[PDB]
Design a protein around this ligand. Structure first.
Ligand SMILES: N=C(N)c1cc(-c2ccccc2)c(-c2cn(CCN)cn2)s1
Ligand SMILES: N=C(N)c1cc(-c2ccccc2)c(-c2cn(CCN)cn2)s1
Ligand SMILES: [Cl-]
Ligand SMILES: [Cl-]
Ligand SMILES: [Mg+2]
Ligand SMILES: [Mg+2]
Lengths: 9, 231, 231, 9
């Protein structure tokens, strides 16, 4: 499954 | 709203505490209460809102996918209504969260957002939550077009008003490319958008400080990872 | 109860689905509904009940510890009431979950449990949820004694009715040793209990099948790990 | 912090 935008770590 | 009696600043403080405690439903309730105070949100506050609801809906989406897979297996295979009922329960909850977020954007975050960094952020969010609705829709066509329309408006503003390395612009393009691949049955459009986004960002990295470079390249890596999966 | 209209078997099925979907609040609500049907629980059902509530209360305990640490740091240091208020909110929720579990045990799971494997399981659970109440209590003395009393009754039955390798007996002794170390300020009693439990289980492993050996030794490893931390 | 009984994996 494609990767979407992640929250800033 | 149950947060109507709490000060805006206290809601923001408690949202940050909830994040630290990994209490994302609480975090989302606090941030909804803050939005409902009627004032615009700062950059940090917009990201708190997104973190909270992304975590809530992310757990719902993961659960829905598990249950949908079990349901699909059961329909090949011995039967009862329970798997469908429980998948429907989780689905309805997920739709409710998406409707809540969309409602906050429509009342009245988007209409008051004039700067590119707020307006693009909220329009991207609108696309994202319509996309999550589309994932479970089966009706589906209009939900898909609502996601597309929000992402397209965000893209048009982002290309005019932000540099190609801006992290909101990058995250928008990333998520619109996921929309094309996973929702709109447009893998070629997904690949083209990811490639053009990556290449235009690469060419603008030289303008950035070390900290901005780290932020932008982290998102670019997701574009690259998807391109590797998609090709 | 909101689960009053659902069949017992459907509640159990949905609890298993909720577990697969990592939806532990739903799992706990389904299992509470199953308990409230009034029938005794099978071994598998008792473990579903425990899994569900252990996950719910475990998240609450982790959040409470984060917030309590922030609160303690703030009271050395610039101030507002928000950290205390939010710690109190999480605490009250946690107490509510513990009270719910204790209420199920008292109405009427324990009184109908006659076999050692059910009665010890439920008395251990009673000790555990009083222990979780004790973790946040500041009143504390009577809660501590309620945990102690439940664990002691469970221990007395377990020593008479179960072999030393029985996983319920082992888990009970493990948790009673944690009670002694972390709640009752009795580290020596904790160490003694863990040592005696481990050694008596070791000596009974020869009687077990391969699968029972794996189950018992897994729990014994936790006794050993605690002894390493405590000495 | 001490380790308590774990759920069966
Ligand atoms: N408490 C959190 N999770 C977050 C806090 C912030 C933050 C925002 C502004 C100032 C200080 C912190 C976040 C942020 C920033 N951006 C944009 C650059 N990509 C994305 N997220 S996220
Ligand atoms: N769906 C789950 N999580 C669980 C299912 C079972 C289970 C119980 C009986 C039969 C088949 C499965 C569990 C169990 C068993 N015991 C006792 C041995 N230590 C501890 N837990 S746990
Ligand atoms: Cl259901
Ligand atoms: Cl609060
Ligand atoms: Mg005010
Ligand atoms: Mg019936």
């Amino acid at each position: 499954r494609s990767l979407s935008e992640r929250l800033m770590q | 709203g149950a947060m109507g009696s709490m000060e805006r600043a206290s809601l923001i403080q408690k949202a940050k505490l909830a994040e630290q405690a990994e209490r994302y439903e609480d975090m989302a309730a606090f941030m909804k209460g803050a939005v409902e105070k009627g004032e615009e949100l700062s950059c940090e506050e917009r990201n708190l809102l997104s973190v909270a609801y992304k975590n809530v809906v992310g757990g719902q989406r993961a659960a829905w996918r598990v249950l949908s897979s079990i349901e699909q297996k059961s329909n090949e295979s011995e039967e009862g209504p329970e798997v469908r009922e429980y998948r429907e329960k989780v689905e309805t909850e997920l739709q409710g969260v998406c409707d809540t977020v969309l409602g906050l954007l429509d009342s009245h975050l988007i209409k008051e957002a004039g700067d590119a960094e707020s307006r693009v952020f909220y329009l991207k969010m609108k696309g994202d939550y319509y996309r999550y609705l589309a994932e479970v829709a089966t009706d589906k066509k209009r939900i898909i077009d609502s996601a597309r329309s929000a992402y397209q408006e965000a893209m048009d503003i982002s290309k005019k008003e932000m540099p190609p390395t801006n992290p909101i612009r990058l995250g928008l393009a990333l998520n619109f490319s996921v929309f094309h691949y996973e929702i709109a049955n447009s893998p070629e459009e997904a690949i083209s958008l990811a490639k053009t986004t990556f290449d235009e960002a690469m060419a603008d990295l030289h303008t950035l400080s070390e900290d901005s470079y780290k932020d932008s390249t982290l998102i670019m890596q997701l574009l690259r990872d998807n391109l590797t999966l998609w090709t």
